[PDB]
Amino acid sequence: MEAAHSKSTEECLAYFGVSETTGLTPDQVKRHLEKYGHNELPAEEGKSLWELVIEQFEDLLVRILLLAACISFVLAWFEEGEETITAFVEPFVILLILIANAIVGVWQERNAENAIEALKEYEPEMGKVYRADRKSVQRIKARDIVPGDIVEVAVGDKVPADIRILSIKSTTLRVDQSILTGESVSVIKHTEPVPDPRAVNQDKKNMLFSGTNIAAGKALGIVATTGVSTEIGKIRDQMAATEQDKTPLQQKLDEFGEQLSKVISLICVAVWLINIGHFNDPVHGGSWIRGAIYYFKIAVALAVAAIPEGLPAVITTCLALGTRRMAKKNAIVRSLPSVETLGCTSVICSDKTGTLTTNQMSVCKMFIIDKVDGDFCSLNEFSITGSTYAPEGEVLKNDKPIRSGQFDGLVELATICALCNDSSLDFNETKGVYEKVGEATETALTTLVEKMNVFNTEVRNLSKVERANACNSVIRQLMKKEFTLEFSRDRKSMSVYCSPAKSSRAAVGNKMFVKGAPEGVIDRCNYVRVGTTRVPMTGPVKEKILSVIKEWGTGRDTLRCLALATRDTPPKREEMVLDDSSRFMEYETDLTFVGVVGMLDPPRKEVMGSIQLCRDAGIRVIMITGDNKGTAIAICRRIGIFGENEEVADRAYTGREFDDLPLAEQREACRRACCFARVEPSHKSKIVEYLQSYDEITAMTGDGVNDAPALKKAEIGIAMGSGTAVAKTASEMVLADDNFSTIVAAVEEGRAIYNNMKQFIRYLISSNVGEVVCIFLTAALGLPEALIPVQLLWVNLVTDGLPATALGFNPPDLDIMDRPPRSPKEPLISGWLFFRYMAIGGYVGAATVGAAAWWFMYAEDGPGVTYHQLTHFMQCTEDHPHFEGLDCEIFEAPEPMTMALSVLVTIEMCNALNSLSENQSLMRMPPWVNIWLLGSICLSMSLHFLILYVDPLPMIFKLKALDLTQWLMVLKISLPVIGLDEILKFIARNYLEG
Numbered sequence: 004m005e006a007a008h009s010k011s012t013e014e015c016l017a018y019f020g021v022s023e024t025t026g027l028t029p030d031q032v033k034r035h036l037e038k039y040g041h042n043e044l045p046a047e048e049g050k051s052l053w054e055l056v057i058e059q060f061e062d063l064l065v066r067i068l069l070l071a072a073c074i075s076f077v078l079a080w081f082e083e084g085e086e087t088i089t090a091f092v093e094p095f096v097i098l099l100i101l102i103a104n105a106i107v108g109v110w111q112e113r114n115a116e117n118a119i120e121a122l123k124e125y126e127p128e129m130g131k132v133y134r135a136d137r138k139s140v141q142r143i144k145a146r147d148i149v150p151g152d153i154v155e156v157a158v159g160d161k162v163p164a165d166i167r168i169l170s171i172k173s174t175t176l177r178v179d180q181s182i183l184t185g186e187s188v189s190v191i192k193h194t195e196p197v198p199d200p201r202a203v204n205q206d207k208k209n210m211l212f213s214g215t216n217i218a219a220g221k222a223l224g225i226v227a228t229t230g231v232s233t234e235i236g237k238i239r240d241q242m243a244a245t246e247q248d249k250t251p252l253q254q255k256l257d258e259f260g261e262q263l264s265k266v267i268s269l270i271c272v273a274v275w276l277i278n279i280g281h282f283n284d285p286v287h288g289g290s291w292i293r294g295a296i297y298y299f300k301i302a303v304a305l306a307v308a309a310i311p312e313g314l315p316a317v318i319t320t321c322l323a324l325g326t327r328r329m330a331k332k333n334a335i336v337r338s339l340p341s342v343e344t345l346g347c348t349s350v351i352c353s354d355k356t357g358t359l360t361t362n363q364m365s366v367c368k369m370f371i372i373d374k375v376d377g378d379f380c381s382l383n384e385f386s387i388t389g390s391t392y393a394p395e396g397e398v399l400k401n402d403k404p405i406r407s408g409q410f411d412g413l414v415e416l417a418t419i420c421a422l423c424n425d426s427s428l429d430f431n432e433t434k435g436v437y438e439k440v441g442e443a444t445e446t447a448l449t450t451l452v453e454k455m456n457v458f459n460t461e462v463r464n465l466s467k468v469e470r471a472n473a474c475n476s477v478i479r480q481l482m483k484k485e486f487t488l489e490f491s492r493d494r495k496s497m498s499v500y501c502s503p504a505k506s507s508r509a510a511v512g513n514k515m516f517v518k519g520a521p522e523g524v525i526d527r528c529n530y531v532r533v534g535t536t537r538v539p540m541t542g543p544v545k546e547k548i549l550s551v552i553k554e555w556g557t558g559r560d561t562l563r564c565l566a567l568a569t570r571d572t573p574p575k576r577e578e579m580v581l582d583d584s585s586r587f588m589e590y591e592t593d594l595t596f597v598g599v600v601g602m603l604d605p606p607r608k609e610v611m612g613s614i615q616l617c618r619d620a621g622i623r624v625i626m627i628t629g630d631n632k633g634t635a636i637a638i639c640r641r642i643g644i645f646g647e648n649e650e651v652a653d654r655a656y657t658g659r660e661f662d663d664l665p666l667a668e669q670r671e672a673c674r675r676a677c678c679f680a681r682v683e684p685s686h687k688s689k690i691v692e693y694l695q696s697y698d699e700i701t702a703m704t705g706d707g708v709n710d711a712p713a714l715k716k717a718e719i720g721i722a723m724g725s726g727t728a729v730a731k732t733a734s735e736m737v738l739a740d741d742n743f744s745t746i747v748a749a750v751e752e753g754r755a756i757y758n759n760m761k762q763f764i765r766y767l768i769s770s771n772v773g774e775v776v777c778i779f780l781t782a783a784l785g786l787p788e789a790l791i792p793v794q795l796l797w798v799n800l801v802t803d804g805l806p807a808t809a810l811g812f813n814p815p816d817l818d819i820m821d822r823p824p825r826s827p828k829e830p831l832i833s834g835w836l837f838f839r840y841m842a843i844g845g846y847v848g849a850a851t852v853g854a855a856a857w858w859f860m861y862a863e864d865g866p867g868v869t870y871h872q873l874t875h876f877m878q879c880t881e882d883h884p885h886f887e888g889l890d891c892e893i894f895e896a897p898e899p900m901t902m903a904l905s906v907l908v909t910i911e912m913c914n915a916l917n918s919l920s921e922n923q924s925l926m927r928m929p930p931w932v933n934i935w936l937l938g939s940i941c942l943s944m945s946l947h948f949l950i951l952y953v954d955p956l957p958m959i960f961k962l963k964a965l966d967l968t969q970w971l972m973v974l975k976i977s978l979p980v981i982g983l984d985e986i987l988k989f990i991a992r993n994y995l996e997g
């Protein structure tokens with residue numbers, strides 16, 4: 004339907020040939036499905052991972068290496084024909100590191116994006132429509148909606164397809180169009196057409212765009228367009244303009260990227276300078292610049308060596324791993340910061356109904372007045388059986404299945420439950436189960452009236468689908484619902500205006516049927532009803548009504564309670580202004596109390612355990628609900644927020660009690676209280692905010708539209724997969740699983756990512772530092788060159804590659820979830836950690852010179868026993884009579900350097916074994932823990948041996964194999980790096996843990 008906003012309701016209805024309250028006939032759906040196709044869009048797949056490769060070479064750190072490899076090719080064509088074989092190998096050692104990391108990155112990324120899409124596709128989105136098939140609105144797959152059928156949407160819902168509003172059942176309809184038109188505040192909608200057929204979306208005050216959300220109210224509409232013709236689907240791929248930012252921790256690390264890029268950049272030019280006197284030597288050529296271009300390459304190489312090229316990748320990787328490990332538990336991570344941030348969470352604020360609880364509602368208990376006389380009041384309690392929304396069960400007065408329509412009080416009771424209710428019940432033929440439509444609290448009421456069957460209607464001969472709303476319909480046919488004063492959380496009630504059907508149908512005039520939070524409703528009653536009788540509300544009656552509410556609520560079943568009243572003589576229809584939902588409370592006055600219903604909503608299985616684990620991880624769990632304080636505290640005990648016999652005077656507050664404290668007090672209350680009840684949507688947001696003023700990382704969990712502000716306000720918000728679209732829109736993560744536990748797992752995972760970044764940094768820094776202090780300790784002790792350009796690039800590629808990246812795969816620490824949360828203040832590199840760096844870096848630096856020197860000094864059996872005084876070697880062509888028959892060439896020998904390059908690689912692979920934990924022992928956390936690391940250690944350890952024993956290589960890399968006893972040395976000097984950190988780990992484990 005083109006430009007449906009231009010034509011009236013009748014024009015659109017007729018245009019498709021549909022009856023407004025009936026909807027398309029099965030043959031109209033078959034036919035329309037063909038002419039219009041299904042209501043969906045072309046999915047997104049992944050053939051060429053090319054765009055996922057470009058991103059691997061975009062970070063600052065990799066570009067510097069990208070430049071390095073580039074420059075090392077400028078010297079390739081400016082190299083003399085003698086060692087060209089080693090001039091071209093350089094660029095490929097700077098690229099081979101980059102490329103290997105690129106693979107693990109893009110690969111890891113493709114995995115995440117896949118588990119994600121497999122979780123998003125898992126659950127088909129539903130829609131609510133009227134089809135001629137069934138008298139009551141039925142639930143269908145969203146992708147089955149065709150232009151033409153009547154669709155129903157209410158608060159919380161997500162618009163399934165471009166819809167022309169036919170009717171607005173509430174006094175207002177608001178919509179979150181942000182995703183489309185871009186406007187922030189919810190916009191009002193109407194049913195009148197907008198003449199301008201060119202008008203912009205923002206002027207279509209009668210349409211509802213697919214993918215937007217109902218912020219408030221309920222409305223019936225006819226579908227105009229679906230699938231690709233939606234003003235949402237026409238701008239899909241033609242959009243993709245949601246520029247993915249960068250997680251706080253990422254920027255933190257990439258910041259730390261230049262913070263090292265500056266330092267490293269300096270130590271390099273701090274080498275090209277401390278060797279300006281060597282630019283002219285017999286060794287490095289001789290020319291006035293031929294020696295300068297050399298040490299320029301010792302710099303550029305030490306740079307490439309020092310720079311952590313794996314940092315960007317490993318972070319990117321650990322993140323994709325997070326999304327993946329979460330998707331594995333049916334948690335959709337809508338924002339990469341989530342897991343990370345959840346790591347730092349110190350308080351988990353959580354909605355009760357449908358979040359902590361299951362939102363499986365069923366009225367098990369109900370009561371009306373029985374007899375009133377003086378200070379004596381009696382109620383007729385009843386019990387109802389069946390726990391699902393199935394119309395199967397009985398009403399028992401005293402263990403005896405009772406005929407509800409026998410008690411006049413119950414007739415009304417049911418009348419109200421049916422009339423004052425924006426929800427229905429639908430039967431799923433596929434699943435063979437009765438499903439709710441709308442809010443559980445309300446459908447619960449729907450099933451109750453079906454069980455009550457007060458007008459002894461013949462239902463025994465009705466299909467499972469018809470039996471669903473039979474008795475409800477019967478009651479509707481007896482009263483015309485004029486308009487509805489929709490539900491509002493400030494009044495905590497909802498009413499409905501009705502008049503008799505025909506000329507008859509109990510023609511006592513007009514009525515309003517009210518239902519809501521027992522307190523509010525009971526106070527607005529001046530009369531209790533006794534059967535068809537009516538008597539003035541008195542202290543004793545009120546006292547009694549309330550006490551039984553209190554019992555059921557704080558009792559073992561911890562029932563959710565609701566009061567039912569009717570206004571016997573409403574105002575005149577005209578005397579009522581239906582624009583201000585604030586005026587609604589007064590139209591709900593001079594009420595007559597009819598009865599109360601208590602519903603059960605069992606708490607989720609994993610909530611108790613999950614909370615206990617949060618307690619251990621140093622994480623609080625506040626309950627935020629609109630429900631009665633009593634039923635709240637009761638539940639809080641059941642799920643383990645409060646002890647079973649704990650005094651909770653200062654730790655439980657109603658919205659009112661809370662607003663009664665001065666601000667500074669309200670703030671403090673958030674720090675000790677763990678239960679807020681009968682609190683509004685502004686309250687939850689305020690609570691969370693308070694917690695944040697103490698600079699805490701706060702999370703919020705919910706499912707209701709009342710949780711949206713909080714969810715948005717909180718650092719990380721988590722929506723139930725069963726909840727509302729609006730709640731989900733406001734969240735950083737959805738529990739499709741509905742499993743409360745996953746929240747904790749996410750928290751563990753977020754601490755994991757962090758510790759993995761730490762060890763990755765601790766490794767790369769302690770290591771690359773020993774490399775620099777190996778060279779500066781060389782020039783300072785006067786000893787000959789320790790290494791050469793390619794010899795650096797090699798140690799680089801072999802120590803700062805897969806062995807480092809693998810750290811990102813380190814498992815969670817032994818006490819990760821037993822320490823309190825990481826203070827957001829805590830600095831990246833601890834003061835004690837920087838000693839640890841230099842204390843380890845200093846060893847490997849002086850353990851690599853002590854090895855090349857061992858080839859000269861105490862050169863046991865090694866050809867060239869120079870012994871004492873090695874500091875001087877430049878004075879051999881001038882003072883040979885100082886060395887006994889020693890050829891001045893043993894100083895240019897490749898053997899001392901090979902001893903060094905091997906101790907380097909080896910001591911580093913040993914050091915990586917230290918990076919499986921921060922402060923845990925290599926025995927407490929065995930090296931075999933991270934298998935991925937070992938496989939990498941060995942891939943490198945081996946990759947190095949190919950250089951030492953495969954003819955063409957040791958030539959290019961200017962090295963010479965070692966005796967099986969010289970390796971015993973390489974080890975004898977490397978393996979003790981483990982004992983050093985082990986001591987440093989013992990120090991920080993018995994004096995400085997945090």
Ligand SMILES: Nc1ncnc2c1ncn2[C@@H]1O[C@H](COP(=O)(O)OP(=O)(O)CP(=O)(O)O)[C@@H](O)[C@H]1O
Pocket residue numbers: 354355356357442444445490492495496497518519520521564565627628629630631682683707709
């Ligand atoms: N559709 C409806 N009509 C009338 N009253 C309703 C209603 N839905 C809820 N109520 C009542 O209004 C009160 C407050 O509603 P609100 O949504 O603020 O709390 P809640 O108890 O439904 C959910 P939660 O625990 O997730 O906060 C409830 O305790 C209930 O008594």
Ligand SMILES: [Ca+2]
Pocket residue numbers: 307308309310311312771799803
């Ligand atoms: Ca490096």
Ligand SMILES: [Ca+2]
Pocket residue numbers: 354355356357358705706707
């Ligand atoms: Ca809820």
Ligand SMILES: [Ca+2]
Pocket residue numbers: 308770771774798799802803911
């Ligand atoms: Ca290294």
Ligand code: NA
Pocket residue numbers: 714715716717718719720735
């Ligand atoms: Na947020």
